[PDB]
Amino acid sequence: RPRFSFSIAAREGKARTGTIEMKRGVIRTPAFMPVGTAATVKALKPETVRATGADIILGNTYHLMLRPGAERIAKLGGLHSFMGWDRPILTDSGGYQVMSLKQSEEGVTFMLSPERSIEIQHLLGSDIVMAFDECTPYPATPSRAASSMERSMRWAKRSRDAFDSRKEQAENAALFGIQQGSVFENLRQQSADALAEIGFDGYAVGGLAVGEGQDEMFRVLDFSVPMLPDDKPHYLMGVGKPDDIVGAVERGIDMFDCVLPTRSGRNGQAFTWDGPINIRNARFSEDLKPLDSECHCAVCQKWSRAYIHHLIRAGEILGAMLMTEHNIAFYQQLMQKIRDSISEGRFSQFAQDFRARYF
Amino acid sequence: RPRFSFSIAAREGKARTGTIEMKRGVIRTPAFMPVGTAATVKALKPETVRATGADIILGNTYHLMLRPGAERIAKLGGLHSFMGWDRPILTDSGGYQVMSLKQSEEGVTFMLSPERSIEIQHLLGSDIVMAFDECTPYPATPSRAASSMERSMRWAKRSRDAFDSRKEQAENAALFGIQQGSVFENLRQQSADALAEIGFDGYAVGGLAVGEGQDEMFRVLDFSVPMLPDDKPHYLMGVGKPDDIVGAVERGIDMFDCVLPTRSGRNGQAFTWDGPINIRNARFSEDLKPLDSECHCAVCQKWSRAYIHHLIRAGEILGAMLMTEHNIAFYQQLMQKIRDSISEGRFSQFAQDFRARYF
Ligand SMILES: [Zn+2]
Ligand SMILES: [Zn+2]
């Protein structure tokens, strides 16, 4: 297996399905990445994450640097060893926290800079390294957006140099750049242009899912994703709801991460093919059906809504475990159905069917 | 398989090892019963509980009556179906809450009476039904102890009549009586005498583990357990720490339940053959050894102290899951070692070895 390869097996319009080959394994695209910010996918064993179908998971530079520390994890053998996941791991750079949570051209003191970010991600043993950026807040005036975008592009250049400066990293991991530019077409193009001239193994669409509404997110995607090199993966960061994912794949996105399936699970929100449900609602107190009647996950093969209703209302940890396993399995099943319909040339129909049923 | 059979395969002094056969399965004794008060063993799937070696688990009349309700569980097919455990289930009667949390000869209003308790346990589909009692608080004067003990014996008689009055229950489940009498020899004897004249499938030692100290608990056991019919199981309620269990088996106890392995797990306390440890302590932050170097559980085969240290300090649910799985597996391994050494006639040596190492 090589450091990094991306092969497209099939297309339908802008939608693509294929595979990313990396040393630690293969990634089926379009791909959903469960998030596991504290060196765990919340409430789940990595075996369980894998069993649900995930090919890769996401970790985070900002949180791990704080606890337990990147150096400490390095000393303990790296993130894979530490949390017991031997498959690829993508780590975010901290660029979202730069928005989510004293800044200057050098970096941000919470101290994270392009160089420190890339080093921390090296200490973790990340397989896919994200460039250190600034997620531009929304709304933003064209001026702010531009100035923000330009700094990230300078930061993307330093991230590259930093990555390239470390042999073990350069030879064994991959580096993705992140496009900014808010909702502005010319800024997005300038950003894509800068990123491609620098050169990355993959390209993320950053700066969305920051409060703009799905309509506006899809508009921006319409013009932004074709700006990215067609022959590399396209990652839409932090997205999203099932319908967000479907619409984004329709516009050229290959990769996703989102806290929804895990967070929603713990909160008692379950995704179904008929739409999301709040299992705490009293209508489910004696519902013997599974969370979803077609879902193939172990939860839905064994436990009833009624049981998981009680668990969640009682604040039982098993409730969190079961909801989370189902939600992530659901998300992976969605990704499988998307992959299959694109391979078979019926993704357009699937997407319509799905929306008709989901909504 | 019969409604209930207890066979002793081997003895060593007062210690016995054997098997309880019930319709839903076989129970190896001396046995440890994980507790699962809210229709779950906290942080664990029943598969996982079973994998650790448990033959039977404990549920509770008081809590289930409150949430989700006994009638509702009955309507949903019974506790086994509801929580996904098809092996025997023992349910406590509520007698501890009578002490732990307006009373009269008829019962206790929190309304639980011998009759309601037995009916609720019938609604749950319990395999081993506990008589409704009053756990006498400690310390107690001889007068109070006696009056308390006498009421429970009257309540034990009504529990029997109630159980016997329901065909499906009488033919498919078993009923255990519970000895009271505080720390007083004559009261304990009067209680054992009353219980045996009524007649039960098994006999519990109640009223201990109420603050009296292990020395005094073992003293009372010394004279109380031979008062119980030798040919039926002897259950020490709510006990206990590993060393408590070993000393109690040395004095004739066949069954145990305790919240320790689960509660302690969530709190970050791990049992080891060298004694309990507080995994949150900073000495473990970079400890690559498993929780215990000889433990056979999946946790100890895959994860390090360092990892579980981080998980617990970070308030991650997986930390609770992993600690709990280990703790319960540990308890079951202890029970297996006790069974094996009694079968082999070396339980005395084991007990000494264990204490030498544990302390
Ligand atoms: Zn499911
Ligand atoms: Zn273990």
UniProtKB/Swiss-Prot annotation, chains A, B:
Q: Does the keyword Transferase apply?
A: yes
Entry's Gene Ontology molecular function annotations: metal ion binding; tRNA-guanosine(34) queuine transglycosylase activity
GO CC list: cytosol
As recorded in UniProt, its EC number(s) are 2.4.2.29
Catalysis performed (reactions): 7-aminomethyl-7-carbaguanine + guanosine(34) in tRNA = 7-aminomethyl-7-carbaguanosine(34) in tRNA + guanine
Q: What does this protein do?
A: Catalyzes the base-exchange of a guanine (G) residue with the queuine precursor 7-aminomethyl-7-deazaguanine (PreQ1) at position 34 (anticodon wobble position) in tRNAs with GU(N) anticodons (tRNA-Asp, -Asn, -His and -Tyr). Catalysis occurs through a double-displacement mechanism. The nucleophile active site attacks the C1' of nucleotide 34 to detach the guanine base from the RNA, forming a covalent enzyme-RNA intermediate. The proton acceptor active site deprotonates the incoming PreQ1, allowing a nucleophilic attack on the C1' of the ribose to form the product.
Name listed for the protein in its UniProt record: Queuine tRNA-ribosyltransferase
| Annotated organism of origin | Zymomonas mobilis subsp. mobilis (strain ATCC 31821 / ZM4 / CP4)
